[PDB]
Design a protein around this nucleic acid. Structure first.
Ligand SMILES: [Mg+2]
Ligand SMILES: [Zn+2]
Lengths: 129, 71, 221, 102, 134, 25, 82, 82
RNA sequence: UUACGGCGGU
RNA sequence: AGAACGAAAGUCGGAGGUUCGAAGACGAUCAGAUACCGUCGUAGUUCCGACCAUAAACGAUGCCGACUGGCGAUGCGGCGGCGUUAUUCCCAUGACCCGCCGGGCAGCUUCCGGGAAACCAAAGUCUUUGGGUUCCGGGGGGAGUAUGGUUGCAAAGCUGAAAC
């Protein structure tokens, strides 16, 4: 009864960074949560991470930098269009200078700016700032 | 908690419409027995005839007689 | 102290082992599990002496970096540690508080017991906790010599030696005062320091003068 | 407000403990709420000890004990003063008062 | 009905602090010293201060009371600083350890550098005092 | 008045209005 | 703080905790800034210079200021490296 | 305990955990070779065995099943294979 | 052992 | 939607009937006692069968999942250890001693955090607001009333307003 493995991954990272730690252990791996973490690693909010591969579903250890505020999840994956995308931004971003809602398209798991650079809508997946 | 998943808009909408029957300002406006029962019948004014000059006593903090009628 | 001059110098290990200084309480604290070696068969947690030496040097480097010498306030409340805390500050030039700590020395500016130090070193984290919880609010770093029982709430350079027995307390005050003068230009690292660690130990009760004069029929007369 | 963390009663994983009855008013209490007191009183009333050993058939006879386990309702335990009123932070210890036998 | 108030006590602790060499265990002489060295505004609290002054004369000549006067205080500089022994409490060169704490100094490469004859722990595990009130 | 003894004097009272309605059918 | 015209529009830059990367505020009055003074290599005496480390009040009160400055002094070449 | 390197655990912190919950999960069990006194037959019984183990040559009883870890009946040879 | 009430507004 | 179980009192029938004892009679106590208190005692408390389906039915806290401090223990399994003790004059298994592992009942501490605070390691991970889902609340009365339906032999249960 883990209805969203993406939601449980990000909640664990959010508890451990406000606790002050350096590493986490994300007990189920997924190819949506490694393509969620490399969206926030390339913007520089986390560090190296290591997929501890097993023969069942793997585990992930993430190096936390301490440069993170909250890395929440939007749990019903509401479909967002490009007209709809700006009003999602002022709901769940702190400012217009920083922070990213990250959403999955047909062309990949992206940003809000990466999805409007390429002019494509999709399904909202999470946010981090 | 509430039911959040996308496709539950039948349950969220049918639960909101029968929980609005639990405050005053919806239920006295949308039932009908609160407009059949006021004497103006959904009006701001009505005419009537005078039957009895009556005086009612004011509340305990106050002590006076308020001059009323029996329209 | 990652150097070679600052290494252990085996001679003084014999002073640790002859004073206690590696024998701790049967319960241990969770923030001191890195300093410990193992529990004995008698329940006693014995302590890695290399780890209490590395913190001893690290506490010494903090006090050397304080420019005004009479500005590292040095406190002790329990009786085992009051002779040591005074002639700590006599030798190294610090400022002592002994006996009872009056609450607000640090946080109240009006009264005449108002000191404003930049560093403070503590004999015991729990039995002398009242300056710890106060020195956190004139943003002051704190040093303690802590045994395995003791919490590490506001301490920074917790020395994991011993703070129960009278021998071990005065020795670690002597060992810290020796090495903090030696990182100054006062001991030239070669000859051992002419002050003896017995000078910092806790005082005997009233039979002091009775016993020494029974072996002094050849000094006064 | 919730006055005490337990509700006066030492039941945690139960739904019903046995009802027992108080001693000096015969009121029915739960067994865990009841204020027990186990009296190991000597049956001889110690001022009357040198009047039964000088009138016994021995010189060394161990006197029998009277083992009466009282238990009270909280109503009669406060009235007969076997539990005293306590302040709102000195309630929180489960140690009994010390012995004071001599 | 005897118990002395704050202004009598605080004015007599300041006398014995500051004129201790000029005092003694007589009442009628200490009455006259405090008469001549302190401004007392009447006769009744004069000798009532002098009473508590003589009460502290016998009190501090038996020991160190709250006594910041010089001679009782300089005499404990010959306790904190004096009695440095001629042979140490540390340097006995014959001290005991246990087989696990010598393994602690074995990785410190001090195993044969030291003398350190060992004692063994008496093998019981009888620590952790028994539980419950009796 | 207590609320378990308010419940009694309405349970005693709505068996008395239930019975007069039974009379005047 | 770097506007689009390229200039600093900011009263000050605030310190951040060397243990936990979080900003010490203007009234986080449990936050220390300590000096650890290294020594010269041949003789082991204080040579004038030192190292500054900040510990915020959140991570100090939490109780691991010791494991902090044992881990960023090990980082500095201090301690055993063992 | 903030910067505990939980990707390289020590082998004695890895051993004193559950058979799940580890950095990589692994059984506590093993296969053991049991030689009876007086037979030329190596038997390859599982450690947490569950059955009344009978042999072929000397078909006597060889271990007793219990709660956790199967108990060899009479004093017989034992080695932990692989 | 018994110990029941205290007009309204301020 | 639909069902199964459901303290006590209660209802119907058959056994039983010691104690206790609503109703009731009597003695006290009081201004009055239809109460407390005392003597007595019916129905009932006990068993069998059928019902009734509610309680401060309470941790006044739905269930499932993860994550976030420490500590002392305890209950049950499992593993590993010095030694003490049992037929044991050896053993295997027990009793204790020292640990670890999972599950449970809780406790003690803490600026984890939250809260209107009491307090809570959950009531935390919430304007930095979204893990799944069920039930339900919307000022105080009227009122769990009136009325319709439905269940029950009955008592009543369930659903359940409004004028004011
Ligand atoms: Mg009642
Ligand atoms: Zn009672």
């Amino acid at each position: 009864v883990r209805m969203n493995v993406l939601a449980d991954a990000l909640k664990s990272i959010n508890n451990a960074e406000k606790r002050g730690k350096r590493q986490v252990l994300i007990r189920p791996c997924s190819k949506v949560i490694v393509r969620f973490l490399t969206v926030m690693m390339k913007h520089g909010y986390i560090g190296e991470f290591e997929i501890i591969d097993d023969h069942r579903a793997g585990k992930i250890v993430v190096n936390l930098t301490g440069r993170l505020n909250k890395c929440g999840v939007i749990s019903p994956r509401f479909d967002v269009q490009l007209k709809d995308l700006e009003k999602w931004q002022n709901n769940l971003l702190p400012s217009r200078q920083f922070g990213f809602i990250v959403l999955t398209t047909s062309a990949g798991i992206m940003d809000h700016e990466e999805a409007r650079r390429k002019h494509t809508g999709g399904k909202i997946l999470g946010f981090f700032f | 908690g509430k039911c959040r998943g996308l496709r539950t808009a039948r349950k969220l909408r049918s639960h909101r419409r029968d929980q609005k029957w639990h405050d005053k300002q919806y239920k006295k406006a949308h039932l009908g027995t609160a407009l059949k029962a006021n004497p103006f019948g959904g009006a701001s004014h009505a005419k009537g005839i005078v039957l009895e000059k009556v005086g009612v006593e004011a509340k305990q903090p106050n002590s006076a007689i308020r001059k009323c009628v029996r329209v | 102290g990652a150097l070679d001059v600052l290494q252990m110098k085996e001679e003084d290990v014999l002073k640790f082992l002859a004073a206690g200084t590696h024998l701790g309480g049967t319960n241990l604290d969770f923030q001191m599990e890195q300093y410990i070696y193992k529990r004995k068969s008698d329940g006693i947690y014995i302590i890695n002496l290399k780890r209490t030496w590395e913190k001893l040097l690290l506490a010494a480097r903090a006090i050397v970096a304080i420019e005004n010498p009479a500005d590292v306030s040095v406190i002790s409340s329990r009786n085992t540690g009051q002779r040591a805390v005074l002639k700590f500050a006599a030798a190294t030039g610090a400022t002592p508080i002994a006996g009872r700590f009056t609450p607000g020395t640090f946080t109240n500016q009006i009264q005449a017991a108002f000191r404003e130090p930049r560093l403070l070193v503590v004999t015991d984290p729990r039995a002398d906790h009242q300056p710890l919880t106060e020195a956190s609010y004139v943003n002051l770093p704190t040093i303690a010599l802590c045994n395995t029982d003791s919490p590490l709430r506001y301490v920074d350079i917790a020395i994991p030696c011993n703070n129960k027995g009278a021998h071990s307390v005065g020795l670690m005050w002597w060992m810290l005062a020796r090495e903090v003068l030696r990182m100054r230009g006062t001991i030239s690292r070669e000859h051992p320091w002419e002050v003896m660690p017995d000078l910092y130990f806790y005082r005997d009760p009233e039979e002091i003068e009775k016993e020494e004069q029974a072996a002094a029929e050849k000094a006064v007369t | 407000t919730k006055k005490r963390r337990n509700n006066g009663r030492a039941k945690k994983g139960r739904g019903h403990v046995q009802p027992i009855r108080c001693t000096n008013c015969a009121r029915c209490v739960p067994k865990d709420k009841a204020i027990k007191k186990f009296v190991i009183r000597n049956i001889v009333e110690a001022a009357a000890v040198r009047d039964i050993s000088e009138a016994s058939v021995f010189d060394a006879y161990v006197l029998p004990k009277l083992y009466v386990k009282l238990h009270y309702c909280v109503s009669c335990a406060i009235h007969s003063k076997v539990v005293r009123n306590r302040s709102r932070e000195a309630r929180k210890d489960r140690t009994p008062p010390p012995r004071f036998r001599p | 009905g005897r118990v002395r108030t704050k202004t009598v006590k605080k004015a007599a602790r300041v006398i014995i602090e500051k004129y201790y060499t000029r005092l003694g265990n007589d009442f009628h002489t200490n009455k006259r010293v405090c008469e001549e060295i302190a401004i007392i505004p009447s006769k009744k609290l004069r000798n009532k201060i002098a009473g508590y002054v003589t009460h502290l004369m016998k009190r501090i000549q038996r020991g160190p009371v709250r006594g910041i006067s010089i001679k009782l205080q300089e005499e404990e500089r010959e306790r904190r600083d004096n009695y440095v022994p001629e042979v140490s409490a540390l340097d006995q060169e014959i001290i005991e350890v246990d087989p696990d704490t010598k393994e602690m100094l074995k990785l410190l490469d001090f195993g044969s550098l030291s003398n350190l004859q060992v004692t063994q722990p008496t093998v019981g595990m009888n620590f952790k005092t028994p539980r419950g009130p009796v | 008045m207590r609320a378990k003894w308010r419940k009694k004097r309405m349970r005693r009272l709505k068996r008395k209005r239930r019975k007069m309605r039974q009379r005047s059918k | 703080m770097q506007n689009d015209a390229g200039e600093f529009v900011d009263l000050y830059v605030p310190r951040k905790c060397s243990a936990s990367n979080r900003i010490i505020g203007a009234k986080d009055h449990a936050s220390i800034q300590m000096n650890v003074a290294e020594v010269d290599k041949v003789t082991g005496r204080f040579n004038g210079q030192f190292k500054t480390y900040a510990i915020c009040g959140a991570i100090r009160r939490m109780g691991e200021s010791d494991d902090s400055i044992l881990r960023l002094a090990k980082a500095d070449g201090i301690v055993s490296k063992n | 305990p903030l910067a505990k390197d939980l990707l390289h655990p020590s082998p004695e912190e890895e051993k004193r955990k559950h058979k799940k919950k580890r950095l990589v999960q692994s059984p506590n069990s093993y296969f053991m070779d049991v030689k009876c006194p007086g037979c030329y037959k190596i038997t390859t019984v599982f450690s947490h065995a569950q059955t009344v183990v009978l042999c072929v040559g000397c078909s006597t009883v060889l271990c007793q099943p219990t709660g956790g870890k199967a108990r060899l009946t009479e004093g017989c040879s034992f080695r932990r294979k692989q």
